[PDB]
Amino acid sequence: ADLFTPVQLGALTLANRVLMAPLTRTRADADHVPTDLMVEHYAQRASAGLIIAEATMAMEGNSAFWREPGIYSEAQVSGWKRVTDAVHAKGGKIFLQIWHGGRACHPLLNGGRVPVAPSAMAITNDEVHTGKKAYTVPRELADEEIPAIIEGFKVAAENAKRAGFDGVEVHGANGYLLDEFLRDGANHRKGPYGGPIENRARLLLDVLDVVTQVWGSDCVGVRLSPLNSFNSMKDSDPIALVTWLAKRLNDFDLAYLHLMRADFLGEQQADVVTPVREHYRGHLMLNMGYTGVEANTVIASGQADSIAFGVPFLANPDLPERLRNEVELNQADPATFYTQGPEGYIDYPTISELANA
């Protein structure tokens, strides 16, 4: 196979293996409802084999980025339905990444509410823009409060189904709530959700269980980032962590496992792709730093089943055609990743627009 071979993912048929990774762009409205801009932006990218829509707040009152979308309210379901209808009308496929920001939900973004976490320890290697402010110490969740978080993900997953998505991706990565429980640098707690790997993975696995009850497992993916240092994250043994999870996630019959293979900050290095491919029997989606040539190489070698592209798909609405034809890519402008408005969001050109009609 290569990037342009169709692939089965759950019971969906994806047209190609050029997928769009989830990208927070903070273009939702003040009530966290998707906007006309988001409809146009995702519709422009519907030639992707699959779009994974950006981190979306599962539960009310957990903002980390000010204007991210949510999937807890009726207006949000209706807003997201505009997005999924536009993508389907172009023949694309789209999953929703459902997310709880955990200790990254700064009090100043949430009317003074104290964020929750597996342990009362703040993020220290990143700041929040609100002005630029240090993260605060989160409250340690009691064991008895964890059922309401699981229920919150179940309701988010039911709402995502009503909004017309083809499936959901559970956000188990990048230092947010599920990843904070998973990795021992952020999870110091005792009891059934702390200590050994199987306990630290319990919350993620309990979420996957309820979300699969809503959707059927072949419509649920999970994203993991075992080496990412972002938001003060570390595991003391990432190889053992991903090996255990690769084996255990077979039992959930997921649509896919979406593995970020490296560290945003370049501090933690290990080969996590090899033991994940060896032990995980399902669909392996890889991400981080793939070019078209490398992506074809790793699909053809059998090391991954698909590749999710982040910044290249942000900046190239027609990335699959560009990679197919070996045409130069548009350059991304990081200055507009998180601004408001259409500039740097819906105005990156296609090949044919570039040719100036």
Ligand SMILES: Cc1cc2nc3c(=O)[nH]c(=O)nc-3n(C[C@H](O)[C@H](O)[C@H](O)COP(=O)(O)O)c2cc1C
């Ligand atoms: C502007 C921006 C927003 C992002 N938002 C998310 C997100 O919402 N959820 C997530 O899991 N990863 C997010 N990421 C990480 C991307 O999905 C992706 O892993 C990263 O860009 C590296 O992939 P690439 O090398 O193909 O760009 C974001 C990255 C950027 C640059």
Ligand code: NA
């Ligand atoms: Na506490």
